[PDB]
Amino acid sequence: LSYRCPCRFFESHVARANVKHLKILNTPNCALQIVARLKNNNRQVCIDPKLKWIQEYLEKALNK
Protein backbone atom coordinates (compact mmCIF):
# COMPACT_ATOMS: atom_id res chain seq x y z
CA LEU A 1 0.00 0.00 0.00
CA SER A 2 2.32 2.87 1.29
CA TYR A 3 5.18 0.75 -0.07
CA ARG A 4 4.23 1.25 -3.79
CA CYS A 5 6.21 3.80 -5.84
CA PRO A 6 3.99 6.95 -5.92
CA CYS A 7 3.99 7.31 -9.67
CA ARG A 8 2.32 4.28 -11.35
CA PHE A 9 1.39 6.05 -14.60
CA PHE A 10 2.49 9.15 -16.38
CA GLU A 11 1.12 11.84 -18.62
CA SER A 12 2.92 12.40 -21.83
CA HIS A 13 1.70 15.69 -23.24
CA VAL A 14 1.57 18.35 -20.39
CA ALA A 15 2.52 21.81 -21.42
CA ARG A 16 4.85 24.16 -19.59
CA ALA A 17 2.17 26.84 -19.56
CA ASN A 18 -0.23 24.68 -17.75
CA VAL A 19 2.20 23.89 -14.82
CA LYS A 20 2.05 25.66 -11.42
CA HIS A 21 5.21 23.88 -10.40
CA LEU A 22 7.17 20.61 -10.85
CA LYS A 23 7.74 18.38 -7.81
CA ILE A 24 10.81 16.14 -8.07
CA LEU A 25 10.34 13.33 -5.60
CA ASN A 26 13.27 12.00 -3.66
CA THR A 27 12.52 8.37 -4.73
CA PRO A 28 15.63 6.86 -6.14
CA ASN A 29 14.04 3.29 -5.89
CA CYS A 30 11.43 4.42 -8.33
CA ALA A 31 11.34 5.03 -12.16
CA LEU A 32 9.31 8.11 -12.21
CA GLN A 33 10.05 11.10 -9.96
CA ILE A 34 8.50 14.11 -11.75
CA VAL A 35 5.10 15.44 -10.73
CA ALA A 36 3.24 18.46 -12.21
CA ARG A 37 0.77 20.49 -10.36
CA LEU A 38 -1.57 21.74 -13.04
CA LYS A 39 -2.83 25.32 -13.39
CA ASN A 40 -6.36 24.76 -14.90
CA ASN A 41 -7.51 22.07 -12.43
CA ASN A 42 -4.97 21.94 -9.52
CA ARG A 43 -4.43 18.17 -10.20
CA GLN A 44 -1.10 16.57 -9.48
CA VAL A 45 0.01 14.30 -12.28
CA CYS A 46 3.09 12.34 -12.94
CA ILE A 47 4.79 13.33 -16.14
CA ASP A 48 7.04 11.89 -18.71
CA PRO A 49 10.60 12.75 -17.76
CA LYS A 50 11.53 12.86 -21.48
CA LEU A 51 9.22 15.80 -22.20
CA LYS A 52 11.55 18.15 -23.92
CA TRP A 53 10.55 21.34 -22.12
CA ILE A 54 11.37 19.90 -18.65
CA GLN A 55 15.07 19.97 -19.05
CA GLU A 56 15.08 23.65 -20.08
CA TYR A 57 12.70 24.59 -17.30
CA LEU A 58 14.88 23.00 -14.65
CA GLU A 59 18.13 24.38 -16.17
CA LYS A 60 16.64 27.83 -15.95
CA ALA A 61 15.81 27.35 -12.28
CA LEU A 62 19.41 26.65 -11.56
CA ASN A 63 20.27 30.38 -12.35
CA LYS A 64 23.49 29.33 -14.21
| Experimental approach | X-ray
Q: How many CB atoms lie within 10 A of CB 1?
A: 3
- For the chain, first and last CA: distance in Å? 40
In this structure, are residues 23 and 62 in contact, taking their beta carbons and an 8 Å threshold? no
Beta bridge partners of 34: 24
Beta bridge partners of 19: 38
Q: Output the DSSP codes for 12-42.
A: S---GGGEEEEEE---TTSS--EEEEETTT-
- Binding-site residues: 16-26, 37, 44, 60
Output the CA torsion sign for 48, 53, 58, 59.
positive
- Binding-site residues for heparin: 16-26, 37, 44, 60
